[PDB]
Amino acid sequence: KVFGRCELAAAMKRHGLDNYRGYSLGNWVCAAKFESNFNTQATNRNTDGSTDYGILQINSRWWCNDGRTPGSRNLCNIPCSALLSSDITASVNCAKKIVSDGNGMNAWVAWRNRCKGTDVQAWIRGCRL
């Protein structure tokens, strides 16, 4: 599924992401825009044997198990295929774990390069919520 911006913002808000560990909702929507272009089926197969999965492009080395990646930690305790759902729950739950395991939003390269320092509120302006 390819989300709309406001539809994704509402879903993320329902799942508790606004102000999770001090990151406002627009940070999460921005990260998803630049990671996956809002596409829940996005996959990026890397040359290191890992793959980035889903709307938030969560990597298979540390976070989910795909059975093909060397050094797998599976810290979210899920198959990576759960991250390719039209429902965002598993991706949200694992993203909360990523920030709870000591990392901030810098874990997402696209957030650091394309969201940090910008008016992230623009991503939820006019919506819903």
Curated annotation (Swiss-Prot):
Xref: Gene3D superfamilies: 1.10.530.10
Places the protein is found: Secreted
Active-site positions on this chain: E35, D52
Tissue/organ expression: In the egg white and polymorphonuclear leukocytes.
Residues annotated to bind substrate: D101
GO CC terms: cytoplasm; endoplasmic reticulum; extracellular space
Keyword Disulfide bond tagged: yes
Enzyme Commission code(s) on record: 3.2.1.17
Keywords of this entry: Allergen, Antimicrobial, Bacteriolytic enzyme, Disulfide bond, Glycosidase, Hydrolase, Secreted, Signal
Disulfide partners: C6-C127, C30-C115, C64-C80, C76-C94
GO molecular function, one term: identical protein binding
Record field: transmembrane: none
InterPro entries with a match to the protein in the record: Glyco_hydro_22, Glyco_hydro_22_CS, Glyco_hydro_22_lys, Lysozyme-like_dom_sf
GO biological process: cell wall macromolecule catabolic process; defense response to bacterium; defense response to Gram-negative bacterium; defense response to Gram-positive bacterium; killing of cells of another organism
Origin superkingdom: Eukaryota
Reaction(s) catalysed (UniProt annotation): Hydrolysis of (1->4)-beta-linkages between N-acetylmuramic acid and N-acetyl-D-glucosamine residues in a peptidoglycan and between N-acetyl-D-glucosamine residues in chitodextrins
Domain (C-type lysozyme) ranges: 1-129
Family the UniProt entry places it in: Belongs to the glycosyl hydrolase 22 family.
Function: Lysozymes have primarily a bacteriolytic function; those in tissues and body fluids are associated with the monocyte-macrophage system and enhance the activity of immunoagents. Has bacteriolytic activity against M.luteus.
Miscellaneous section: Lysozyme C is capable of both hydrolysis and transglycosylation; it also shows a slight esterase activity. It acts rapidly on both peptide-substituted and unsubstituted peptidoglycan, and slowly on chitin oligosaccharides.
Subunit structure: Monomer.
Protein's recorded name: Lysozyme C
Species: Gallus gallus (Chicken)
